[PDB]
Design an enzyme around this catalytic site. Sequence first.
Site, mmCIF file in Angstrom:
data_model
loop_
_atom_site.group_PDB
_atom_site.id
_atom_site.type_symbol
_atom_site.label_atom_id
_atom_site.label_comp_id
_atom_site.label_asym_id
_atom_site.label_seq_id
_atom_site.Cartn_x
_atom_site.Cartn_y
_atom_site.Cartn_z
ATOM 1 N N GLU A 199 88.908 6.886 74.856
ATOM 2 C CA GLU A 199 87.744 5.585 75.430
ATOM 3 C C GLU A 199 86.621 5.562 74.280
ATOM 4 O O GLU A 199 85.955 6.853 73.099
ATOM 5 C CB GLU A 199 86.952 6.195 76.004
ATOM 6 C CG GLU A 199 87.732 5.746 78.141
ATOM 7 C CD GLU A 199 86.840 5.916 78.614
ATOM 8 O OE1 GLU A 199 85.380 5.188 79.346
ATOM 9 O OE2 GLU A 199 87.447 5.566 80.047
ATOM 10 N N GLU B 165 86.252 11.911 82.471
ATOM 11 C CA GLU B 165 85.002 12.498 82.462
ATOM 12 C C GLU B 165 84.579 12.938 83.245
ATOM 13 O O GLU B 165 83.479 12.675 83.991
ATOM 14 C CB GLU B 165 84.299 11.190 82.452
ATOM 15 C CG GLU B 165 85.342 10.111 81.243
ATOM 16 C CD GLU B 165 84.043 9.008 80.702
ATOM 17 O OE1 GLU B 165 83.004 8.703 81.729
ATOM 18 O OE2 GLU B 165 84.878 7.688 80.491
HETATM 19 C C1 LIG Z 1 82.616 4.335 83.241
HETATM 20 AS AS1 LIG Z 1 84.050 4.374 81.763
HETATM 21 C C2 LIG Z 1 84.267 2.476 80.311
HETATM 22 O O1 LIG Z 1 83.585 5.660 80.957
HETATM 23 O O2 LIG Z 1 85.405 4.359 82.338
#
Ligand SMILES: C[As](C)(=O)[O-]
Length: 451
Positions: A278, A171
Amino acid sequence: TIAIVDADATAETRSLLSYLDGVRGEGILFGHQHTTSFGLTTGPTDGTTSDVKNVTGDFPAVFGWDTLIIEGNERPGLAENTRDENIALFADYIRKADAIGGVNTVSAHVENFVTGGSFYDTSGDTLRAVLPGGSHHAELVAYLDDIAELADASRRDDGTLIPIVFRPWHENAGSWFWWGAAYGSPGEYQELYRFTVEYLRDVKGVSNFLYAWGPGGGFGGNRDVYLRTYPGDAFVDVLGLDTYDSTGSDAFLAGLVADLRMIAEIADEKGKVSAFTEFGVSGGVGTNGSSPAQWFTKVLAAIKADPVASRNAYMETWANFDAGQHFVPVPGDALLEDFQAYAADPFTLFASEVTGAFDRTVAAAPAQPVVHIASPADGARVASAPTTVRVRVGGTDVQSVTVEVAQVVDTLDLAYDGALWWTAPWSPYTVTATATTAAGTLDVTNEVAAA
Ligand SMILES: C[As](C)(=O)[O-]
Ligand SMILES: OC[C@H]1O[C@@H](O[C@H]2[C@H](O)[C@H](O)[C@H](O[C@H]3[C@H](O)[C@H](O)[C@H](O)O[C@@H]3CO)O[C@@H]2CO)[C@@H](O)[C@@H](O)[C@@H]1O
């Protein structure tokens, strides 16, 4: 024969990359972060019980972990324990997961070396202080070493190395982590990822890692933006996507289907794997989260409805830390029934449905030659002070390496440091590396700036 970042990976590892790609479109493996170390219905964890197991009747096909364990912040890791003991507990859990029949993945919410803060602390210029030639480079090196320990400790009783999908610096598109977009250029990020892969593969010898890269989510299917950060084909095995929502809106779903079919195409073209690395309801589905109507099934329906968007190997929702924050429903949460519906769906694969993932016989195509300038990285600002130009040429024998600083202001003759880089002193816009290699002449160009 398949394309795998580590041409010398173990049999089972190559087997997994082969499985993960063949599974695309046929079934998506459901994953769960800390599935047997954090629970609400399991009681004291020990690496064998799981909330998924308790509500659905089978373990997720994918078990997620994070380096925070080594740090002692997420169980089985303990603050008290020395990093070396936590590494042992992590490996034990990785073993029990594989024993259960699951696939292991690992993320790294790396601590902010510079400030002593957490991954959420975005101060200290930690990204750039950790890159090759950085003021805290050694810290990162030390951290990666513990990751190499974990790689090696992850073995079956027969000593067989357990494959692990490593997902570092995730991310980065956003800026809530110190290694995010607001703290380094696309180029600086890339060198960060590349040095990570090379240090573990080339320097530490890890051979049971499939590297994953997932910039973020909400790209609207824009190949351009998505890839801006891409470490490149010789560094990534798995192309990911991270997206949480708490509206179940069609708008959300449309965008999600767009991102999913994108990564899927890029994956196909590149001969690699793509996955929903995710996902889940924003803020979780508990006390402090949200209960969007039939959120889980609405998303599955959306994924299956598209032939391309469904060509993603797995989808992992996050940890079930506590009541306020947990991403997998338990008695009392509204979404409990929907999440079971999702689990019972034939398209979602769980631990027991995983077969022939490590016993496959596949060949790793020869590592492709590559060469990048580790320092100064692309889009970085160079100090007036003298600095070391370092080039990395991989996947072939290097005879010589030259660099040309244009704006032609300089010409440097590099020399192998005997361990990783080809270097040379540079006392300061266009840095161009040319390496006369066994695979031919390879060249690369980074563009920087003075202060
Ligand atoms: C902080 As996260 C759950 O996007 O890895
Ligand atoms: O503070 C003591 C408490 O710590 C719990 O573990 C923490 C981790 O140390 C870390 O802070 C983790 O951060 C989460 C973040 O909250 C969010 O969920 C994000 O999406 O993912 C990161 C890491 O994956 O949060 C957990 C718990 O919230 C745990 O060890 C407790 O037992 C302990 O008392």
